[model samples]
Structure formats: structure tokens, C-alpha cells
Target chain A: SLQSDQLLEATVGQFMIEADKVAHVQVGNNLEHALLVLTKTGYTAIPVLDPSYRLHGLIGTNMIMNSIFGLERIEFEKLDQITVEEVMLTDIPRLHINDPIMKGFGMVINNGFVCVENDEQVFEGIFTRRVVLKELNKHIRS
Target chain B: LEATVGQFMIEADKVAHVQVGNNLEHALLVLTKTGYTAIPVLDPSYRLHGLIGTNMIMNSIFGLERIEFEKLDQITVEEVMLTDIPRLHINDPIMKGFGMVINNGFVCVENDEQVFEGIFTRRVVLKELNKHI
Candidate 1:
């Protein structure tokens, strides 16, 4: 229903990819190292990548919180030996840049798919409910 | 007038979770199954570790070769978590609780010991505010 140019114009490519900057890690990275990267980046989620720069998965702050809680329950003091793969999410949803802007909207509104990307699929960018709202607001004239 | 997160905090057991070594496909299954935007990541011991939401997975798989499926399983959660996520204490004012959601964009509510008490979703906060508005 939407034209190609219009869809491209409305797409998230125009927005700066600020939120995508994350603490990327491979499957073999040390847990402590991953934690340090996460703490330093202060991102809600960081992208996990393989050697090819393809996305592997993500680690969010919530994962860290849960891990710490589980450790304390058992009276375990050392969190250093934990691996990033031990707590990362294996399942994820993704979007292509060529996809309609409405698709992104639907994902967030209906399915809560916040992040988006380009045709190349190289981690183009990240989007959230907040970002979607901001994009929608632009079309709403005051 | 109102209730607090303390009143509404879903039991930890009720909160859904996923592991760190899964692929986007797997995360989607959990998200769809759980019907939650964000699912907590955990270790083998079932300890709270990190979080992965619909957004993270969606972004990662936007455009790539179908062969990339194998790489998805190899990925870890450490790469995508927001580490310094805003946290809310149970005793914080109800208005403060709502404000935290608005200001931080996303907040992880914690108990005194810093355990993930529960999530204060923007939808939940906005729904509550609508009553007052």
C-alpha cells in the first residue's frame, strides 16, 4: 500500500544509530569481561556477534540481575567464572531495512520488536517503543 | 490515589526467562509463548542473569543470509544487555516509580539486595497514569 520512496523515507535509516553501540561478545568470551563491557557501555542490551559480524544474540541488564540473584541464593561468591553464553538469549526477532515502516510499528505495538536493520542485515540500528513513538509523533502535526 | 509496584510486582516465578545461548528464532518462540516484550536471561542454575527483549532480536536479524541461523545459536547474551539499566527500589514513591519509567525509558525494579524484583513496563505505568489523567 505504501510507495517505495515513501517507505524508505519513513524508515529508521535517517535516525542516528546511537543505541546500537553495544558491548559485543562472542560465545567464548569470559563472563567477567562481558560484564565489564556491559557496565561500561550502560546499554539496556548489547549485541552478541560471531566472527563474521553476524548477530549471535544479546545480553541485557536483566540477565545480569537474575544471575546475581541466583548466585546469592546459593551463597556463591564468585561471578568471575560465568560465561556470557551461560546467560544470553538464544531466540530473537529481526527486521530488514526494506520492510515497511508500518511493520516496525506493528512489531513494537503488537509484538514488541524494537530493533531494526537494513537490507545488509549488519546490525543497522536499534529501535525501541520510545523511538517508535518519536517517529509516530513526527507525523502528527501540532 | 493508588497502589504501588510492591502491590503489583509479579512473582519472580511468574516472570518468564530464556537462556543466553539461543538464536533469534528461539527467543521469538519464548516471546510469543510468554507474550512478554522482555524475557530475562538466566544461567544453568536459573539465576537471574540478563534480559533480551523483542527489540534486540528483531534488530539483529533484520537482513542476513539464511545460513546465519547457525551463528545465532553461537551468540551470547552479554553482547545485548543494557548493563547500567535504571533500577527502582520497592519503597520509592509511586509517582517516582512512574517517573522512573518515563525518564529512563526502561527500568529494572530491584529489591534492597539488588535482585530483579519485577519490571515496571511503560505500558503499566501509562495505564496507571491514565486513571489519574
Candidate 2:
């Protein structure tokens, strides 16, 4: 279990804020636009946020496809009508910056949470399994 | 600029699958054998149905009592299958494929015909992106 101080020291602000180039959609954006943005950006997932940049939910490629075909059985015509709020995963898990790395790992692995947070949340950075593995490799080498 | 899912999908032959009637023990065996964390659950018709992953199985073992080994065979895949799983279609942008896995944490790749296509793991998505990185 890592303390808040330790987490801050470890991540060094790598995963805290969204990058300027990272594509995102609002809760009310049309589904087609969301799909188009994803296609253009080449991101695996896009974050959905409120006007204030508060973490809202996430819409992935599968959700868009499932909503278009699996749920509606329609062709690729109504992308703009479908808002992200309708298909996004609202119940996402989040971590604050001051939390321990172990806690982050546990939440991500056990509940399949994709982390989200901003400055107010004191999020030092996103600690992913890959980061953990890298640290583990470093420890082993040491 | 347009293509069918059948054209882009990595074909069923390229991906692995698991039967629906099998038990958790069997699913675990197959997962270990194939070295995949997520495995597709299929019905008798081989239609796309649900999924069972390593976490799903390990979570089940936490609260249950230690029962006789006979119960293992009776515990079918349907009993533990996650029906509310996210799925993907062929015409969908490849990024949506990535988002589905990244946002929801898991997604079942399916064709327009609703047939189970493949299970795209997070690891695979990261590896795909790693090429550009």
C-alpha cells in the first residue's frame, strides 16, 4: 500500500490532465460525431466530460457499435442524434492523486476501472498496470 | 473509404473461443491453455452470447463455501456468463473498437450478423498502439 506522498513521488504528474490533442465528447454530442472523432483520433477510448471538465463517463468503440447495430439495428446514418450520455458507462471508477498505487492497481484489476480525475481530485497521475509492471521490472533489476 | 466487417475482422480462425456449456473449471483450463484473460462464451448454435474472464471466475471463489468437486461439472458457463457485455460491429470505426475495451474495460467483438467474432483484450489494444508509440 502506497501513501499519498509516495504516489505523488512515483507518478510525477504523467497521467493527471487530459492532453490537448486527446479527443473528447460532451454528454450531449451525437453518436456519429463521437464515432468520427474516435476514428480520426485513433484513441482506444474517449472521455466524456461535463462543461466544467468534471469526469462524466466514457464511450468506447464497442459501445458505439453496440448502440448503433446491437441496440438499434440501424445503418450508419444516425450518429449525430445519439448523445454520448445514452451509451457511455456512467459508473466509472476514479482515483485521487494522493491515493496509494496498490489501491489503484486493486481497483483497476478487480473492477475493470479506467481511471479519471482532475486537479481538484489531486490526481498526481494515472498509475496503470503497465506502469506497475515497469516499476516491478526496475525493482527486479535493482 | 468503406469496407465490410468481414473484410477487416481478424476472422474467427484467427481468434480463440470457448463453449457455453462448459463449467468454470473448464473455462479456466481453456483460458490458461490459450493464455487469454477474456474468453467468449457461446451457445449450442455457436451464436454470440456472453463472456467469462479470469476476474469473473476468481471473484466467484471468494464468498462461496467449499463444496464437493461434483458441483463443478454442474456449474455451467451460462451460470457465470456476463450477458450485459459490450459488443462491436464490423462497420464501426476501429477506434470505437479501442474505446469499447478502454472505457468499459471489456468488449466482445461481433459481426453485423451478431455472430461471436473475437475477444479483444486490453493488452492487445495497448500492443496495437505501441507500434505508433
Candidate 3:
């Protein structure tokens, strides 16, 4: 069992979602396909990755929807024509697995979440506000 | 051309929400239809219970893709839903909505009676604010 002390002193590895557990959209997938992947997985945002799960970018529902936000006539046909990379957010913040959890807390307070990476540059999982709060609450109630 | 949240808050009747009893698949359908990962979960009375995200459902079912989705039939929106999401009131200003969503990606908007209104999407609100600048 863990407590607040353990949680605050935790490392990114202790709270980060693992790579395999992360549902990511591959780099080359088309927008329509990406949409399908996002829907199939039910993720608000999914990472864009290479064959080895190296981080390429991040794509979210808002990003997808905003593509045609103010268009006079929304075209589902065009969505299928665009590739995932063209619409992915590549500037998202990244945190190494060894970073302190409190640091992760500070970063996520400004970002909905951050991509967790390792020294080898492998795309790990994400660190989100939900995970941070839930982890602390779980230990508190224990 | 841009105004505060009170000027542009999406009305209650215009917003779509996930139901409390809805299954994961049903919530998935709603997510796709609305182009939103953030969806408010409600009862028949439109009373807000919590919020659910497409991303959350995806994370919960990460490894289960090996099996049929039918295997997830027993799960409800409430089961995988994320409650205690940050929310704003109808009277809140655009800048308040703007600040609330800047880091959170999106914020749920509600009323005094606790009815779900609509979400204040960061991108959309930021776009509106940018034109003023």
C-alpha cells in the first residue's frame, strides 16, 4: 500500500502509464483511419508514433474536430484524405520516467497531460491530472 | 467579434451528453458523433453525474482489443467515467472560461440548478479571443 508521502516522493515510472497500455495512432495512418482509431479506443487524445512507438506527435479529438470547424460545408470525404502526421501536435511537453512526480504534477497542471519517455527515447505512457489526483486519493483513503 | 462565455455559452438544449446508464459502446458512439473526448454524463432528468472522455474509455480497454467489444457489454459509462471534472457557471466570463480550459484542454459548463450546458473548448475559445487581439 502507498500513502501521500509515497505518492509525493514517487517517480514518473511509478505513475506513468506503460507503453503497451497506451493506444496510439501510427504516423502514416490517414485522418479517416485515425478517426476510426480514436473512436475505437475512446481516447480524448492519442499519441502519434512510429513503428517502434517513438513519439512523433499527439492527436486529440479537438484537433480532429477543429480541422473543419468553420467550414461552410463539412466534408467527411476530405477527412479521409488527410494523414495523421499533418494534424498531430508535435510540440507537446515530454517528461522522462525518472523525473519526480511533483514535477509531473506541475507540468500537468498546465497541460492536460504529458507524454512520458525513457532515456532510450521509447514512447512510454502519459501522465495526466486524473492519475495524479486518483493516486493520492487512493493512498489517502487506504 | 468575440465576447465572454455569457455571450457564447452553448445552450443546454444544443448540447449532447452521455447518459449514466449508457454502455461503453454507446458512449463511444456519442464521442464520435460529437467529435468530443469530453462528454458530460447525465440522467434522464439531465442532472449531471460526471464526465466521461473518449480517451479514458480507450485507456481502460487498452489490451482488450484482442477480444470482441461485445465482451465489454457489461460496463457502463459510470463505471469508466471520470467525475469531479472542473466546471464553470453560466455567469462566468470568457476570460474565466479561457483560463479554466487553457491547461485542462476543456472545461464543462453548468448552471445554478446543476444542469449540463456545454463545454468550453480551449481551441475554439482561444480562436475567438485571438481575433480581438
Candidate 4:
């Protein structure tokens, strides 16, 4: 029950889903396109990237829905008028590619996934809670 | 002693949810207001029907030929909600939820009658794991 030294040696990249495989919307994309991505991908939230594919922020269906929400009801026509840059959450936390698994574990507890970045701050991938649970399942001594 | 999911669940009354007959527009509004990506769908009888999320709402309105935002008001949650989802009972051991919570942020907990009683969340399970670590 005490041979847990391997935890420190684990890296987030080893368990993360690569950025290219993850569904996302560009900052310049309208909410309609964002909705399509979110729907087609079936993910609650997705990374928002710039034209260069660098992480700008995160866009979720909630954000897209809220942006089009008017005083009385949802403004359906504004879905195309609004852009991802206007509503994406930019101040969220992220981990580095070389970060240890423990760092991502700590962050993913509050989030469904932790976005990872490269040395140049380019979006690399995401460490998900699913992997965290799997890791814990493997490590927790039954 | 081990814990049961019921011990750490958020009660049904406290959880944000919608009815099966509710329109997608209303469901989206509830989801946005609560900041939850997905929520449970219940029937008028207060029985669990399915789970509805923003993705479901969007997919229903996204016609292959065109975006039919107008149908948001016409479509019911039952039309797009995920009906074949996993669930846990109140007496299930907490460890059982660790695997179940991986897909959804939480696992819906039901009583003996299969009525929705509450939800066991990833947050609670993660906290428990943190304590163990």
C-alpha cells in the first residue's frame, strides 16, 4: 500500500488528448458555427483558438446560449451575429505539456478537462477527468 | 467504513432540471442559468425521463440543410434528450460512481422505485480521492 512513488514520474501529456483531435471553434467564428461544433462533437465545452490555432479561450454552449439571450427570450437571429471572441472564457487555468500528473489532477477536479499548452503557450491538448478517474482506479489499493 | 453514493449526493430538489415536455429553448435557458452543461429530464410525474444538454438542443435544431432555430420552441426535451444513460442507486458504494462519473459530470441516483432522488457528482468523488491521497 505504500509504493506510490510512480505518481511523480507521470506526465500530463501521457494521458492528454492531442489538440488536433479535439473539437474547437475559432475566435472569429460565429455562435452558429460554435453550436454546430459543440453539437457535432457532443462536448459540453471546447477550446477557442485563434487563426493560428493558438488557444484563445474556451467556448461552451452555455456561453453561446447566454450571448443570444435577450431580455424576454432567446434572440435566435443573433446566433450568427455574435462571435466566439465576445463570449469565450479567457481567464481560465491551463497546464503545461511537461507538467506532472498531479498538477492536472488538482485542476481537473473543478473542471471536466484541463487544457494543456506547449512551451510557446500554444494549445497542445487536454487532460480529462476520465483519465484521472482511471489513474485513481489503478492506484487506489483495493 | 465505506461511503454510499447517497451520503454525498446533491438532493433532487437542489439540482437544476427540466421536464420532458419542456421546450428546448426553456431547457437551454435553465442550463445557462445554472451553469451546468447537462441536467436531468423529469416527467410530470416526477420520474426520471432522460438527460438533456446544450448539445442535444443544438443538434435538434441544426437541420442538415439549414439551421432551424425556430424549432427550438417547438421541439420537446423528450425529442432530443439522452434516454439510454447510466444510473446509480442510492445504496451504491461510492467507488461504483468513480467509473460512472467519467462520462457525465454526475451520475443520477434513483430510489427503489426508479424515481430520481439526487445526483452523485464528480466533485464529491474527487474530494474523496484527494482525502485518500
Candidate 5:
């Protein structure tokens, strides 16, 4: 670990959970696989990517909760038949990779995390609440 | 349109509460089954004991730098759970819980006896608030 001078500037891209490091699911993965992935990886949710590996959306445990225990339950046998595209959160906020860290921080403050993208709408990384606080705290030394 | 906490409070029956006596493996199973980031821990009489999070488990393992999964059975939930937690009552304003949740991920709601109710989550509150808008 280097000194304070070695730190990168406070920008969204610099503080991201890089795309490769993020555990994610693909579009057509069925509920069984999605469930398996979450259970095996021990993540609360995984982002959903399309064939192009672009950010499609994110799916969380609540989606699975709704599947198994909501007002309407999907029969256990039918779990394998349901696709991730059918339940993933498609409306998650996105910020340009070069945008202000606070911009991404504000979005994730309430949403938990936000997908970071580039001009081409590529999936670059994610900015999460923990990162926002950690990054900004660096700027607060008295 | 405005709503109070009572209007959006999640009922107790739908929530999952872990017992302090549980082993880490048992807690892990609960986390997997419910897919919760954190869960409320309770005593036999439903007294709020503490809270546990997935990060706590991950951080515990990270510190050891590679513990066998089999060792999970030896760890107890109480040993790793967070004793200080944020909470809300049924009559507190909905916004109060909302503010706490933004930082805590979720907030505990309890009755006068400290009887555990359900949790208030980000998505559901958004869904309920969306209905009003």
C-alpha cells in the first residue's frame, strides 16, 4: 500500500468493482441456475448480462423470494423453466464511467448499487454504497 | 399521497429470524434460503439478540485467508453477529425507517415487548411509494 499521493482521484470509474470481478448471470439462465449461482457464490444478487455481455439488469434475492413465497408461488418443478429475463431488475440507474463519484454515490445510496457504463453502453463496473463512503472518507482528513 | 409506517410495515410471519444458539452453517443456510443480506438474531423468547450479515461471514473468512467450509459448523452466530443495530417501531414515520435503511440495508421493527416483526426493505418500500405516485 502506498501513501496518500498514490491514491487515484475521486471519480466513479476509479472506484468501481470491475466487470470481471463482479459475479453475474446471463439472460436465458433459468431460475434454477440463477438460484444455484446465488447459493454457490453466496451473493445477494447478480447482474444480468446479455449475449453481448452488456448490462441487461440485476436480479436480487427478493426476486427469488417473490418466486418462492410471494402472493403467487412458482411450483418447484417450474423453477427450471423460468428465465432470468423474466424477473431481473431492468430499471437500475446507470452512470458514465467518467462521471463524478458523488453522482454514482447518490444513486447507490438508495439503490444499493448502480451499473457503470461507457459511451457505447458497455458494462464497465459497479459502484456500491461501501465504495462511495470509503472513497469520500479519504477526502475528509482534518 | 402520504403513508405511515403501519401502512408499509412488513408483517412478522413473513420474516426470518435466526436464533443466537445457531451455528454458522445454520445461519448460512438461512441466508441462502432467504437471500437476505442481513438477518435479525433473536433469543428463545423472541428478544432481539443482534444482527448478522453476509459480509461478516466473508470478512471472517477473509481474515483467516482460507478456512475450510467444514469449519463453519464450529462457528456460532452469536460469535459473529452485530450487537448494535438500528430499529423502528410500528408507529414511527415511514420516512424514519426509510432513512435508516439507506444506511443499514434494512431496519428492524419491533413491538413493545421487543417481539420481532418483519423487515422493511428497499424494493418493497419503493414499490409501495410508487403506488402512491
Candidate 6:
């Protein structure tokens, strides 16, 4: 029981990559700026934040490029016209700092990473699927 | 419970992918249509080349003056795809994939000649873990 149950004993805060270190684009930012941040950081997706650093949603290269897709060709000029708030996925899985690892276990199955927030819903960090698998492997081995 | 990666991997035929010679425009269309953030890049012989994602495609066309939409057709998948990506053998143990699949959503499976096989995904692994937990 202890082997399996040890996973439940952990919390999101323990495994999350802190928000300050997490790459992000602001809500008012244009799609071009968002793409630049993603490209430079080598992250497929990153969190979207407001001026106050409140979590808004998630932006990824997929959404950025998809937004510019036209009937004949991708409208590249649209990158500057659109804002991150226009395309970022807002209804994504979110977790609290005190949430149990078991709560994120299923969440990471579909999402690459789940966003972590404080009690006030301010952006905190991320709980990646990497940590989830690492912990699961340790528990399974024991 | 002792299943290998091959047992759970999605077959190569079923996986969405692009070829090394394909232009970035075509690759972008495939990625958007499939809704996969990243997909395998293969050669004409179906050997695994690397991985190409929306990020890679965008990065290539980002220019100093403006976003260069015209360069999408000029660029080939081979020019911008991540060549040094993590991959797995068909016979790799399930445990071996745990760490490799962390940054990359799925690990590509290949043969002796590096022929593309399929992919072992996080969804499959988590589904297995769900049964035990």
C-alpha cells in the first residue's frame, strides 16, 4: 500500500516549476511576440498572463499558426493584428498549490503540463507530465 | 502488466507525419489539421529523420523586418526540424520510456535501419497507471 500510496502524499508545489522561471506571454501581446517567446524558449506551449501576473490562459505555436490559416494560404500578416487573448486556450486544466499529486495524475495524461496557481488564482508555476511519470516510475519500482 | 512499448504504441500507418522534403506550408497544414503540436519527420524511405512542430515552423520564418510567409515554401522540413530528438527502439522496456517522454509528448519507435515504426504516447502509459492506482 505504501508503494502506491506514496504518490498521493506529494503536492503540486513540490514538483511545479516556479512561475517566474516559466516562459509566458502577456494577454495584450501580439501573436508574433508570443511565437518569438515560444521559439526562443523552445517551449511548444507556455502560459498567458495579465499585466498583474494573473493567469489568463495558455498559448502555443499551434494556436498562433492556426489563427492565421486562410482559405488559400496562411495569412502571416495577421500575426501582428491578433492578440494572445484572441487565441489562447482559456478552458485548460488548472491545479492549486496544495493539490495532491493524484489530482494531477490524470490531468497530465492529456495535457503536457498543468498550470499551478495560488489560492487567489495567480499564476504560480507548472506541474509537468515529466514529474508525473518520474514519480509513477519510482512508485512502480518500489 | 509487463507490456513493452511496441505493445501499446500507435502503429506507424496510423500516425500523422510529414516527409523531409515537404515544405513548411504543407507541414503546418498537416499539424493544424491533425491538432498535434508535433509530428515525426520521415524520409521518402520512411526512415525517422527528426521532429517538426509548430514552433520549429514558426521559428524558421521569423524575420527581422516581418514574419516571412513566403519562406514557408522555400524551406524544407529537414532544414528546420529538430534532428537530435529522443527516440525509442521497438523492443525498449516500458520503464525506459518514462523519462524520455517527459519533454517530448511521444517517443518515436524505430527499427534497426531506423525505419519509422510508431509512437508510444503518454495517454497509453497513464491509462496503464490508472488501472493500478
Q: Please tell me which predicted candidate would have the highest TM-score against the true structure.
A: 4
Top candidate on DockQ is: 4
**Per-model TM-score versus the true fold:** 0.47, 0.45, 0.57, 0.91, 0.58, 0.90
Full ranking by TM-score = 4, 6, 5, 3, 1, 2
- Write down the worst ten-residue block by lDDT for model 5 chain A: A133-142
Local lDDT at B83 for model 6: 88
Q: Note the DockQ of each predicted structure.
A: 0.04, 0.03, 0.09, 0.66, 0.10, 0.61
Each candidate: fraction of true contacts kept? 0.00, 0.00, 0.08, 0.64, 0.06, 0.64
Model 2 TM-score on a 0 to 1 scale: 0.45
Docking class of 5: incorrect
Candidate 3 residues B1-133, lDDT tens each? 2355766666667767878888876776677667666678988878788887767765566563232334344689999898868888877867667656645666777787777777776545534533442
Better-scoring candidate (lDDT), 2 or 5: 5
What's the lDDT for all of these models? 0.55, 0.57, 0.70, 0.83, 0.70, 0.85
Across B1-133, the per-residue lDDT of candidate 1 in tens digits comes to 3567665445566677666566555664566555565677766665456777655654554343221223444566556644555666666666556555544444566666556666666555544433442
Instruction: Give the per-residue lDDT of model 5 (tens digit) for A34-89.
Output: 76666567666788888887888888755754665423322445456678999888
Model 3: runs farther than 4 Å from truth?
Answer: A140-142, B1-36, B39-133
Tens-place lDDT per residue, model 3, A7-124, is 6677987888887888888888877667667767766678888888788888886576556333453344656677789888888677889998877876765566688888876888
In model 4, which regions exceed 4 Å deviation?
A1-5
Q: Lowest summed-lDDT stretch of 10 residues in model 4 chain B?
A: B60-69
Better of 1 and 3 by DockQ: 3
Per-residue lDDT value at A128 in model 5 = 75
By TM-score, the better pick of 1 and 2 is 1
Better of 3 and 5 by TM-score: 5
Best by lDDT: 6
Candidate 2 lDDT by residue in tens digits, A94-141:
766645455554554433335446556322233454454344333423
Q: Give the runs in model 1 whose Cα sits over 4 Å from its true position.
A: A1-9, A16-23, A71-79, A110-113, A117-121, B1-103, B106-121, B124-133
TM-score of 5: 0.58
lDDT of 6 by residue, A1-142 (tens): 2466555788888778898888888999999888888878988689998998888899887788788889897787889899999999998867899998778777887788888998888999998878777777777777
Write the residue-wise lDDT of candidate 4 on B1-133 in tens digits.
Answer: 2888989899999999999789988998899989998899998777898999877777777786556767888988888899898899888888788778876688899876779999988888887887777
Candidate 6 stretches with Cα past 4 Å from truth are A1-5
Q: Is the docking of candidate 6 incorrect, acceptable, medium or high quality?
A: medium
